[PDB]
């Protein structure tokens, strides 16, 4: 069974990594690019970008542990723990050469530690729409002069007593539509049909729980990154952020400048959080061009 339709010429497959069965979709030829999705979604957020990248790269898009069709992690959900799975997965397909990385939302949290600990393995890096977990997140406001802030879900999802699963179970499709659209500028790309696909996936009980365990580990990830950040990233990096409702605006680049020696950033107007879907044409162009500066098929 497949939760989302595989683009023509791609394969849906699984690979056991440290006892955890990870789902991924792979296609193309050439140097490897790994694309890592975020909360509320799966590999499928990349499905429009993947055929274009596969003209020049081998493309792999895994489901994060516990999400999509991937088994939950056996170690834990902190960034350093999850990054081991993703690093080992990528290195199975690119054992002798560095690979490229594109990551969205908590995909950043789940890859930053393996990037900084294995810098020679990462040729080029693209990060979009999430802070790297550090002390800056403790200053984000709970409430804004416009109304509800974009990050109160940090506390909701991290709350104990399984608060979020208990309130959202049985209402997953309602919650996800509200959550996605509230973080979007171009909301009407989120058709009922597309929302149905995403909601059915994260409504699996272990996936609903996995979704929130990433946030229950957020403070641990901050503590991990306080040590890791003592070494700046040396590879070429690009940040993308939405400029519209739901977008991180200038924060994405400004934080990354503290982490990376070589970074360029873009803010996409009229685009919110969900860049691959809200603003596919400019986002895909920016990613393809940036990765194509390095060698490719």
Ligand X SMILES: *[C@H](CC)[C@H](O)C/C=C\C/C=C\C/C=C\C/C=C\C/C=C\CCC(=O)O
Footprint of ligand X on this chain (CB under 6 A)?
38-40, 105-106, 129-131, 140, 150-151, 183, 246-251, 273
As given in the structure block, the two tokens for residue 225 are 């990154």
The helix (H) or strand (E) run that includes residue 237 is strand 237-242
For tokens 């509200």, what's the residue? 178
The helix (H) or strand (E) run that includes residue 266 is strand 263-268
Neighbours of 226 (CB within 10 A): 12
- Closest CB 280 distance from ligand X, rounded Å: 17
- Contact positions with its own copies (CB under 8 A) in 11-30: none
- Closest CB 40 distance from its own copies, rounded Å: 15
How far apart (Å, rounded) are the C-alpha atoms in residues 121 and 27?
Answer: 20
Are 86 and 60 contacting, i.e. CB atoms less than 8 angstroms apart? no
CB under 5 to 8 A by kind: which of ligand X, its own copies, none does 248 bind? Answer: ligand X
Pairing of strands 20-28, 58-62: antiparallel
Q: Rank residues 17 and 248 by Cβ distance to ligand X and give the closer one.
A: 248
DSSP-derived 3-state class of residue 221 = helix
| Options 29, 149, 234, 250; binder of its own copies; rule CB under 8 A | 149
Q: Rank residues 13 and 142 by Cβ distance to ligand X and give the closer one.
A: 142
Total residues at the site for its own copies (CB under 8 A)? 35
DSSP-derived 3-state class of residue 52 = helix
Asked if 137 interacts with its own copies (CB under 8 A), we say yes
Asked if 144 interacts with its own copies (CB under 8 A), we say yes
CB under 5 to 8 A by kind: which of ligand X, its own copies, none does 171 bind? Answer: its own copies
How far apart (Å, rounded) are the C-alpha atoms in residues 268 and 253?
Answer: 12
CB under 5 to 8 A by kind: which of ligand X, its own copies, none does 130 bind? Answer: ligand X
Site string for its own copies, 169-208 (x = CB under 8 A): --x--xx--x---x--------------------------
Pairing of strands 32-36, 99-104: parallel
| Options 158, 189, 203, 288; binder of its own copies; rule CB under 8 A | 158
Q: Which residues of 254-272 are buried (b: 16+ CB within 10 A; e: fewer)?
A: ebbeebbeebebbbbeebb
Asked if 280 interacts with its own copies (CB under 8 A), we say no
The helix (H) or strand (E) run that includes residue 205 is helix 205-216
Minimal CA–CA distance to 217: which of 39, 87, 37?
Answer: 39
Q: What residue is closest to ligand X based on CB?
A: 249
Pairing of strands 122-128, 237-242: parallel
Q: Rank residues 158 and 280 by Cβ distance to its own copies and give the closer one.
A: 158
Asked if 140 interacts with its own copies (CB under 8 A), we say yes
* Segment contacting its own copies by CB under 8 A, of 43-51, 89-97, 105-113, 164-172: 164-172
Task: Report CA torsion sign: 71, 75, 79, 83.
Answer: negative
CB under 5 to 8 A by kind: which of ligand X, its own copies, none does 11 bind? Answer: none
Q: Which residues of this protein are in contact with its own copies, per CB under 8 A?
A: 135, 137-149, 151-152, 154-156, 158-161, 163, 166-168, 171, 174-175, 178, 182, 218-219, 222
């Amino acid at each position: 069974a497949e939760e989302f339709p595989v683009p023509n010429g791609f394969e849906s497959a699984y690979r056991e990594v440290d006892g955890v069965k990870l789902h991924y979709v792979k296609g193309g030829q050439g140097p490897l690019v790994m694309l890592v999705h975020g909360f509320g979604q799966t590999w499928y957020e990349w499905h429009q970008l993947m055929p274009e990248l596969a003209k020049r790269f081998t493309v792999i898009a895994p489901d994060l542990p516990g999400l999509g069709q991937s088994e939950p992690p056996k170690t834990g959900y902190s960034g350093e723990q999850v990054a081991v799975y993703l690093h080992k997965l990528a290195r199975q397909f690119s054992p002798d050469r560095p690979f490229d990385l594109v990551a969205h939302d908590i995909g950043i949290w789940n890859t930053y530690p393996m990037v900084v600990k294995n810098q020679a393995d990462i040729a080029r890096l693209v990060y979009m729409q999430a802070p790297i977990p550090d002390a800056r997140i403790y200053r984000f406001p709970a409430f804004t002069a416009q109304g509800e802030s974009l990050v109160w879900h940090f506390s909701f999802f991290a709350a104990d007593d399984r608060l979020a699963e208990t309130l959202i179970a049985g209402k997953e499709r309602f919650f996800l539509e509200h959550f996605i659209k509230s973080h979007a500028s171009n909301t009407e790309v989120f058709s009922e049909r597309l929302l149905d696909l995403y909601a059915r996936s994260y409504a699996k009980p272990h996936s609903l729980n996995a979704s929130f365990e990433y946030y229950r580990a957020l403070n641990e990830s901050v503590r991990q990154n306080a040590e890791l950040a003592k070494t700046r990233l040396q590879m070429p990096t690009m940040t993308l952020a939405g400029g519209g409702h739901g977008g991180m605006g200038t924060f994405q680049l400004e934080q990354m400048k503290a982490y990376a020696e070589d970074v360029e950033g873009h803010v996409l107007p009229g685009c919110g959080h969900w860049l691959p879907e809200e603003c596919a044409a400019p986002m895909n162009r920016l990613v393809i061009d940036f990765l194509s500066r390095g060698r490719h098929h």
